[PDB]
Design a binder for this molecule. Sequence first.
Ligand SMILES: O=C(NO)c1cc(F)cc(F)c1
Ligand SMILES: [K+]
Ligand SMILES: [K+]
Ligand SMILES: [Zn+2]
Length: 354
Amino acid sequence: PITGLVYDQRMMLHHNMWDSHHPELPQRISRIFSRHEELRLLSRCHRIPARLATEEELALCHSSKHISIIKSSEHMKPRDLNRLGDEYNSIFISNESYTCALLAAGSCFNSAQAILTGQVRNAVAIVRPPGHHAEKDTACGFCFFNTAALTARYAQSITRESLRVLIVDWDVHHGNGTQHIFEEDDSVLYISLHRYEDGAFFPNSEDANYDKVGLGKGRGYNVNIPWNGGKMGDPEYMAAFHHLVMPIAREFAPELVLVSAGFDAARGDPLGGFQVTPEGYAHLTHQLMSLAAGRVLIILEGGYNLTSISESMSMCTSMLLGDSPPSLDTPLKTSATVSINNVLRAHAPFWSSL
Ligand SMILES: O=C(NO)c1cc(F)cc(F)c1
Ligand SMILES: [K+]
Ligand SMILES: [K+]
Ligand SMILES: [Zn+2]
């Protein structure tokens, strides 16, 4: 009954050479690791080594054009780095960026392999840069390659091609890249909760609305839970899990659960504006461990208050290790009930549990 953990200090080398205070900080991952030490969680986990993703692995989800462009940045002078980064939506690049993106992905491949070979029951991946905004053909939103999407395809590649993978994306932003990569796929169920605000919140696309349910064979296998009207917290997230995430996931019966675990919906985040607590994230984790015989891999995405993300991710690891869920502390905001009922109207056609 083992929990795995992957962390590698080399992923701190990716950095913003114009703005040392850009919130996607190198210390995001060292702070989370340090808090695991302080809580004596690290010695309770089995350390999984990081590795580089290969180019063939990246091609499970990304075009050769995109792979080639990001790879070429490793050798670019600052002028071309600043210029290349400015061509994407919200990207900075250093000469170390490509390597760190490869390590983030390969770390998650090794973690998924450890779970699927029975070496650990579940795992946490403390990685950066994030992945869920990255598309097949372009970088976006601090993300170069789509780590979670690649990990789902990697998992299928070492088991069977149709392995049922659930990706629950609780980062406060919509994972536009993960949705698009699997939009026509019934083997990977994508469920995202995200601040939407009728399309005004990053990444600023109505692709994130509840009526986008999937295409072709994938009809019904894309579940967007969009929040509108300000602050959301534990009551809203627990309601969404009760009414939507868990009934759907149980019917899908995944063989592996990946969490796109951004912690920017957390109380204190400078960018999310929400107030999910560390106890709230622990309860979401504990609920997902009831799926896939416990085979859950928690993958860091966003989250920018260093104290908040360190406390929140550590509580998730405590749940994976089998600790009892903490106590929670309110009626739902009206608009949250509106959002949940809209998703039920969108997905009741596809799920007999709805
Ligand atoms: O990746 C992100 N959050 O987890 C992110 C990406 C952006 F382009 C902007 C932002 F404020 C946040
Ligand atoms: K999300
Ligand atoms: K899908
Ligand atoms: Zn985010």
